[PDB]
Amino acid sequence: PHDPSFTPTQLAARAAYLLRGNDLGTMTTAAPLLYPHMWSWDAAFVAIGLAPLSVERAVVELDTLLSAQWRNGMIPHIVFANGVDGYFPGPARWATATLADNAPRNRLTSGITQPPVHAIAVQRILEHARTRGRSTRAVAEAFLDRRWGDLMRWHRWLAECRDRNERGRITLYHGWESGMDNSPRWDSAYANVVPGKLPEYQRADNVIITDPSQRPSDGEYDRYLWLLEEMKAVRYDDERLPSVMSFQVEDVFFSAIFSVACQVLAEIGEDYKRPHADVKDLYLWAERFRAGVVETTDQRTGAARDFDVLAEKWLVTETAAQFAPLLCGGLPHDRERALLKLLEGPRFCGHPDLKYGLIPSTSPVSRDFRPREYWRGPVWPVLTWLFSWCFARRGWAERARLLRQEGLRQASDGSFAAYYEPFTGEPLGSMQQSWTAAAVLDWLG
Amino acid sequence: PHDPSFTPTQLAARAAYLLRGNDLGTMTTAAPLLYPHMWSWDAAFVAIGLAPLSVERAVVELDTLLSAQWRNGMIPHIVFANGVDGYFPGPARWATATLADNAPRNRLTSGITQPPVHAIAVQRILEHARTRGRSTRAVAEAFLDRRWGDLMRWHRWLAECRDRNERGRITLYHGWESGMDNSPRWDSAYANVVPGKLPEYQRADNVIITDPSQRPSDGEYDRYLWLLEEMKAVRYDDERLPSVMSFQVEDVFFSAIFSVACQVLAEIGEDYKRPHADVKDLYLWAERFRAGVVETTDQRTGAARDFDVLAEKWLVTETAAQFAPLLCGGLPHDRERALLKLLEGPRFCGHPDLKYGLIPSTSPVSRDFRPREYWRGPVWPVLTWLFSWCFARRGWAERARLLRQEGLRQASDGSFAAYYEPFTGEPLGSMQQSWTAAAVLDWLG
Amino acid sequence: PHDPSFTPTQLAARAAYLLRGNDLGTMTTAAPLLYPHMWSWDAAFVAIGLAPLSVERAVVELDTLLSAQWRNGMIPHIVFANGVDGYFPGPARWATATLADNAPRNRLTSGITQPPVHAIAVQRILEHARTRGRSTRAVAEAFLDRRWGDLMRWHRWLAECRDRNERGRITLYHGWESGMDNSPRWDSAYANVVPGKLPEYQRADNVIITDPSQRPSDGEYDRYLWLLEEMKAVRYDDERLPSVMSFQVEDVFFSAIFSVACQVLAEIGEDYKRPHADVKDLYLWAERFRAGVVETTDQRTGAARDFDVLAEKWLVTETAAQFAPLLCGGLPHDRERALLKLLEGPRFCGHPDLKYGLIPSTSPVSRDFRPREYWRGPVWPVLTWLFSWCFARRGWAERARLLRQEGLRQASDGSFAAYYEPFTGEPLGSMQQSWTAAAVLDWLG
Amino acid sequence: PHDPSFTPTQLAARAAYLLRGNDLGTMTTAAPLLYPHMWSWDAAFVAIGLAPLSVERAVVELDTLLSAQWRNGMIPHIVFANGVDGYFPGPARWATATLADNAPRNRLTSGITQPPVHAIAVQRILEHARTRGRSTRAVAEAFLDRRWGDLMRWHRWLAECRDRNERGRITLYHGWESGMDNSPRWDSAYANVVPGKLPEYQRADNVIITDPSQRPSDGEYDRYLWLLEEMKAVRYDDERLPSVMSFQVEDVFFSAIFSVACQVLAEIGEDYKRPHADVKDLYLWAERFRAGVVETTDQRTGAARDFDVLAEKWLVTETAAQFAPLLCGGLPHDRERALLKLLEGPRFCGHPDLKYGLIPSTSPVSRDFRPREYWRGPVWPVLTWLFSWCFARRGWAERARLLRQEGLRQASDGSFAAYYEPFTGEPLGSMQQSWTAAAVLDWLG
Ligand SMILES: O=C(O)[C@@H](CO)O[C@H]1O[C@H](CO)[C@@H](O)[C@H](O)[C@H]1O
Ligand SMILES: O=C(O)[C@@H](CO)O[C@H]1O[C@H](CO)[C@@H](O)[C@H](O)[C@H]1O
Ligand SMILES: O=C(O)[C@@H](CO)O[C@H]1O[C@H](CO)[C@@H](O)[C@H](O)[C@H]1O
């Protein structure tokens, strides 16, 4: 009435209450109605949010995701909950249980992947478990015992089948795999996707989120759904995808996340006496992908670039993905200072009209910028969380703390939206988004 | 490892997480396995705990309890969840759906009552709703519209059928109705309960809580279960119970709670323009029960006494029920100072061996005292909460704040036990007790 | 910075830092440059703010003020610091050292009084001291032994010399004694003050606060200063002031405070075994001034009126002093509901343009309202504190909490201003005002 | 009281109150009676604790200390307050005013130095100042303009005059310069100090701290004071001390601090456009002293050793200074894991008898350990702070957080003692130690 913002204790309670209310038993939905299934990197953040509440339940979330891992090691980006419709494309559309030789038995999953933040979740679970004593450490250690092999096969499938040429960058076959469906990053690559005779379909996402300004366009879904046909045509075979996919991009943000993830998992590997060969491979991949990320960077600004494998050209766009090198490290000293100056200046966190000192998903001074349209400009708490956590890991304590503080100030309305209008702070997209409650729960301590 | 206590934000999140994990949909269990149904005054406290998380869901909890109200107005102390066994005595044992003309249709309930803290819950819901704006106030106001009549019939059934002689004290026909099953208060009244040929039975409560020191004795359950037979024999008829029950006591703590509750509901009645006749009746009952409570008190110490209606004598015991007059008011000035001195001195909160400055359920210097045995000595957070809240209502801000502070310090292990050992602080009884999470959620703000 | 507000720990730290910065050694200035001496009711709030920091130093503050008490029991409203200039009217202009037979012998002070909030500060000191252990309890109990007689003579002087006709209201001979210099309450009384040959003077207050819209006018100071001449002419003789003073009002807000103070001090007397005859007198005065406040009240709204003794008429103004009866109690239930409704509705706390849900010194819909002008409209943290504390003592826990929370939100800029613009929140008057830091500390310490 | 610990707001308030109480105007005493002057590295921590309270006053603290800098760039370890007695050795005993050609002209100071934590305080001031807006930024930037040259001459004096052979370690001529007077690190060096005709003296430190188990022995003071005679004999001439001093050690902990300080100051120089030649020198010294620290390290555990220059041997002791390499970095990955394992295991933080998970000044399993005796065992909040801050800068967020939390839990008694008994938590040394209040404020402000 005079202040509709919640106290930190109220906010934490409401966040935990949302997370438990989205739990179907062994998996947590990403959002009640818009995303009523398990999503891959959402589940990682959800496990980060459960770790303060229940190490046992946080571990279960990851167990459920890994039970859906493909025979080649790929973690698919959706694990469908039994009987739940209302999300398109659903399991019938992917038809992975029919066509994919590597699809898991008695789980319905999608046929593409999503970024490897999972090792970060494992670290948070272990750090929480160490503060809780003997029996709770045993739960988390038993999880490592049971799942170390599966985490390795996840990291090895990325390194070996999505970086076939040892370039230290991850190749994607769908914008969905980047986590940033309609980012300006992929526009020119999608412009070259000319769909054929696409089996007719009817969206479900914009029945729930009805504002057209907040979701992709019907022209964009036509390209998204046509890439699926191309995959279905080759039965999702890794060896055949390079030859048939109309969309092939190296994703520098995904690559930087993978480098961090390998480094995190290698340190876990040493602390818990995992095999030396695995630890050595993880450090190898962390350095390889650190270097591949750095190779994309503007020698002046340090901004990281995506690469269109088909067009054979660098993708120059002004999104938060430019800051990938800050996550994983490796830039020369001068180039990193310039990139931090870009991050803090008028083109991103320093823009005079922003309500919060947070990272907009696209630069407000970019021609591509749209204040309400999903990844084309809104501020996403999940990015705030990932940048903050990675910055703290770099030693940039005060930078990390400013992002956390502004992110809590933004979240303190209690909507738990997935993204926010960068100028007015209006919550957008789905409310009750699980990974926004998780970010809040992890921040509050 | 060095400090297994949670931060206030961690504690609030864990409390909300427990409450949602105990929600079956429209009702919240009192504890996961020991009490897997809805209990009456537990549900009131649960609604207090839900009010910071969701006014809509808090209101639903009370709606579900009131849907189980009997035709004469009585709120029964258990509302059984469909299909759930593992609590004895269950619905088959009560047989209320068969024998009780006033039992509700399509709800299975017990046949006895429990204290009227419900109006207190309504106040907390309204106070929360007023801080949340237009649409949330409308939810809470619509609840008053829909349930004011049911709350009146609850209060009127207590005033008219459990105080038949207008003594301003509530008569009970079972120790369970007091909320304090095995309190020393009822020992001499139970000594006069000589059971007949009691249909054989097997407990469930001490299969779950296996420490015999923490639950009543088999001799005590034999008396508890024999009173049920006597009620069943007269088909739970109000008019016939005075003539047949082997246990008839006026409960001064219950009476004081009813006085407060009438006062609270009368003020709600005025603020929301309820009928004048109802408001006038509520103020009448609050004064009548204030006076009946005061009439029981030691003219020196102010300690309130229960009354054995059958033996026709005052029950002098040294439990926290002695402090009933502090809840509702009405003592002469000198007598209240003496009662507060008793509360703060070596016999209760001032006892030198207590871990926390909290109210033990029985005085540690009493011969009846048992440090682990349920209501014979342990510290109960639900009592801490009720005393604190009532003290604040009396204007005793600093007293209330000390109880809240010690109660949070006690709860900060995160067990959410129903009672604690008064000397060592060991959590006892059931963990994951819903009303202990609710107390914590209400305190933290 | 996107938000200039401090966290609770930063704010508490900054408030304590301020309070110690204003410490001259044995007295705390009311503000660094505007008020560089000890003021009487500021010193009580300073003692309250010191008590979470140091019971010993809080006791010293009251000891110093009480060492300046007059021989007849009056506590003067200013105790000047040795050799300190920069405030007018200074010691020279009051001439109490050469003229007042009752002025203290080794202290320079003013010649008029101020509200008796002192017993409230003694209660807060005692409440802190009991949480701090035995040597701290002993410090507080030794202050009681040393000063109980002085506090009694303070209250007795008010009850006997400023309520000569036992009307249960306090007579003021200067608007400064009300604590609200330029309140609209006193305009019609001040219109009947006609200065004679007033010795020339130069103001110092508006040299420091230069914005003329925040301080009284020259015309108003002409009358304030002439009243000093009338008192000097009769050498501050208690007996002669009814016959010579051109200003004589019964202050209903001062009277209500005295009622509370008497009741608080009587309860201290009982707890600490002070003479029964003293406690009885205090309870007698508490009741008399409660009744005296209620006799002024409007029959429809319960609003309290001041009385102009010279003109024999009730003073009807729309200022925060109308809510005096909420402080001391006494109104019939129906009239206090009306008065609470006036406090919360659109004329005070509920006015739609107010930035904070707080009590403006004058109603914004009154013709007397000026948003910048001292006591004619601005919101004063010190009044928020006093109403919050009195409301909690009435048992209005939620009301007291809402005032505290809005008070903290307003104070969270760290300006510690004496008063604030009610619509914009602009800090006004002196920054670094000791009693505003003291309010914040009590609300948080 | 059942728990003597303060809430975070009360603690922050009490720490700020203390810091202002020790303020003499332009300098803060290190403690009220034991150390009633300005100490050099205490003044840096005081600046850090002042920065959340007042950037202007924090800048003044450093300005005052830097106004006492010698003409050759040395910052002396004591700046005496005018006319203040009560500490020995006082200005008379040092005789720097009459003897030291480089002593400042309008300040009385000591003749030896102390660790260069000052650049860390400048970073904290700058970090606070950027959150506070433009006039505060301008205050901090103007301090940089005024004092950048003085900070450069401070670091240059250390790099050139105390590392004459460019070994990348700092040479001390007095155990007091290490900040750890009686550390076991220096015992074998002090055994080779043989006093000649030492002018008689009377201690003042153990008049204030009377418990002889908390301070050094007379024998130890005999050697501390004789070293002053050796320096006086050559008039504190930098060039002559290698030839005359009976004490010459390379302090590896001081060296690591200087490495960090150089790196922090170089980053400030870049951000604020200071001369490139200065920034290059700072990065050069940061690398040189990093390498110099790593060259001392044990090949199995990574533990750093001090060097006795006169005897030409590594000093192997088990004190917190072994963990110097954790501060500045430089160790091979495998050796730093071993060193972290030593820090956390049963010889330091993981010792089973420690009350708090904190770093004892000497390992409890060492033969040199004394639980009460100054730097021979007690836990010092100031070291907790420095390790926590350095650990966060390394990117060890969770490690830094655990030290902070245990540090706050230990400080929550409000004693603000300089050091604590490691097993019982008893506060020791001087209460009201300014740098302990400063640690708490930084951890909370
Ligand atoms: O819009 C969609 O259909 C899906 C496609 O997988 O994408 C969005 O929702 C997911 C669940 O929150 C997130 O994992 C993505 O990052 C986000 O962009
Ligand atoms: O032990 C039992 O079987 C039941 C009998 O109804 O009693 C206990 O559990 C209830 C649920 O928590 C509480 O309502 C009671 O107050 C408490 O004493
Ligand atoms: O303006 C003045 O000269 C003085 C005269 O007493 O009055 C103001 O300052 C005092 C000190 O803070 C307060 O005690 C008053 O309430 C406030 O009105």
Ligand SMILES: O=C(O)[C@@H](CO)O[C@H]1O[C@H](CO)[C@@H](O)[C@H](O)[C@H]1O
């Ligand atoms: O004991 C002394 O006389 C002095 C000599 O410098 O040393 C102690 O006190 C100083 C001021 O707090 C600290 O700076 C030191 O680190 C600490 O060891």
